[PDB]
Structure 1
Amino acid sequence: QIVQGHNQVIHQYFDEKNTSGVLVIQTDKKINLYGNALSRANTEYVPASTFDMLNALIGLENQKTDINEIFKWKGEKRSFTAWEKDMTLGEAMKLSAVPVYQELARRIGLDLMQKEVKRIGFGNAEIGQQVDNFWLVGPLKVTPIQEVEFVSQLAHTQLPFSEKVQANVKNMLLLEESNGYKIFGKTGWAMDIKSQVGWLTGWVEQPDGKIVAFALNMEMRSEMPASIRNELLMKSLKQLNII
């Protein structure tokens, strides 16, 4: 099941970007590890925005929102300018608009959130006490192997949510498409005074329908482009002939 993969080459790629990281790939029930810091795969980190996928699933499942709802921008200056507008849950997914995902979390509220997170068994399922930021600062944590298992199940409509809800959240996640290969996923990035953890978790849907899921997890620095996660993921996917 969980093993290291054939690759001297991906190890290099990560050293060549001057980072410590791992790339977990899950096809059917086989999980391979690649990178220059494999032990990260079993290390817990905060999911940061990658949690937006689970938030949306819980929110939609319990009818706290719907895919047509327009979340209103009330006019205050926000941490990013691209967030400064009315938007749907789907458009928030793509922009990683935290304030939408915080409104939604509050609608959900703490008891349902923690019943649902324990029900799903996400990470260490620890939400503790603040409903509106537990995925960004802790206590909630998850490993890269757990994430890839989560997105694999989302990809395959195997999570314990309605089928329509799963399909609606999948449809929010399309990043890129070319040669008939689709790539779905979600970035994440948390700025803790310790290290900074960067995520990119999602999947490839190949032309014949086959799903190959991935969870990139690396140490970020403020000097890196945000681009670097996608660049390293796409190089590695090509090298493994997944795309």
Structure 2
Amino acid sequence: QIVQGHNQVIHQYFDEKNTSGVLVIQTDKKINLYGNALSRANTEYVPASTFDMLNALIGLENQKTDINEIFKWKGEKRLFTAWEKDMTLGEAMKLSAVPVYQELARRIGLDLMQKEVKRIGFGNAEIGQQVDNFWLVGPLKVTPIQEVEFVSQLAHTQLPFSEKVQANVKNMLLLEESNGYKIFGKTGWAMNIKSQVGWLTGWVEQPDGKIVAFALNMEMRSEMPASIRNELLMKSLKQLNII
């Protein structure tokens, strides 16, 4: 049941940021839509870094890597200085270090990747012929509703992967943690489109254990702070009494 939530206030929040966005909340097979551009909820977009969650699942499931492996930095200048080091898959997750996730995609290889993305049904499930950038520039696209369903299932260990793998990938995703409320998830930003999409997709684990999943999806400009996504998400979650 996908419905427009009580949206008068969150609408304003999106307006007051001069963006066009949607916030999708899933709380036990109720999905509510918020924001100032609700039609985004059913529009496919490149997932960008949010795909790392699925890449990691597939790689661990198929034993292409393990959570102790240290991915070596060979010495080349990377897009961010923070990425310029040896790191594990979990540290790569937190930093969204693309080269590590590209190295993992190339181990998985094109077939296995396509077969796994189709089995999971992630978005349009098209990865094309280039195994190491399909989630960055296309052709892979996915809706915000499809993303919230995906993270909700990960949070509940309901994806079609091993329980241990799912637990290991959840453990990589912790963003912030106060008042007994934990926020897990993954930002993404498809900086090269004709239109730049920003994601923050994840869930809240409330103190009593309950899970509320989210997927924020908005139009990004270069004028904006990267932090704008976390700011709009947290303001909205507070207004909705989810945190």
TM-score, with structure 1 as normaliser? 0.99
| SS, match of residue 242 in structure 1 | coil
Identical residues among aligned pairs (%): 99
Shift, 1:60, TM fit: 0.2
| SS, match of residue 216 in structure 2 | strand
CA distance in 2, matches of 1:74, 1:16: 44
- The Cα offsets for residues 2-49 of structure 1, whole Å up to 9 and x where unpaired, read as 010112000000000110000000000000000000000000000000
| Alignment match, 1:136 | 136
CA distance in 2, matches of 1:138, 1:5: 31
Shift, 1:191, TM fit: 1.9
CA distance in 2, matches of 1:17, 1:115: 40
Shift, 1:193, TM fit: 3.9
- Structure 1: stretches of 5+ with no match in the other structure: none
- The Cα offsets for residues 72-94 of structure 1, whole Å up to 9 and x where unpaired, read as 00001000000000000000000
- The Cα offsets for residues 95-140 of structure 1, whole Å up to 9 and x where unpaired, read as 0000000000000000100000000000010011110000000000
| SS, match of residue 71 in structure 2 | coil
CA distance in 2, matches of 1:66, 1:239: 39
| Alignment match, 1:57 | 57
Give every structure 1 segment of 4 or more consecutive aligned residues whose post-TM-superposition deviation is greater than 2 Å. Answer: none
How many aligned positions are there? 243
CA distance in 2, matches of 1:222, 1:70: 33
Shift, 1:223, TM fit: 1.0
Quick one: structure 1 residues 202 and 76, their matched pair in 2 at CA, closer, same or farther if it must change by over 3 Å? same
Quick one: structure 1 residues 41 and 167, their matched pair in 2 at CA, closer, same or farther if it must change by over 3 Å? same
Shift, 1:68, TM fit: 0.2
CA distance in 2, matches of 1:193, 1:212: 30
TM-score, with structure 2 as normaliser? 0.99
| SS, match of residue 58 in structure 1 | helix
- The Cα offsets for residues 159-209 of structure 1, whole Å up to 9 and x where unpaired, read as 000000000000000000111000000000012341100000000000000
Mapped pair 1:177 → 2:177: yes
Tell me if structure 1 keeps the 8 A contact 2:55–2:105: yes
| SS, match of residue 139 in structure 1 | coil
Quick one: structure 1 residues 45 and 209, their matched pair in 2 at CA, closer, same or farther if it must change by over 3 Å? same
| Alignment match, 1:30 | 30
Tell me if structure 1 keeps the 8 A contact 2:204–2:211: yes
| SS, match of residue 218 in structure 2 | strand
| SS, match of residue 192 in structure 2 | coil
Residue range with higher mean Cα deviation, 36-45 or 192-201: 192-201
Q: How does 1:139-218 map to 2 (within 5 A)?
A: 139-218=139-218
Tell me if structure 1 keeps the 8 A contact 2:52–2:101: yes
Tell me if structure 1 keeps the 8 A contact 2:137–2:193: no
- Structure 2: stretches of 5+ with no match in the other structure: none
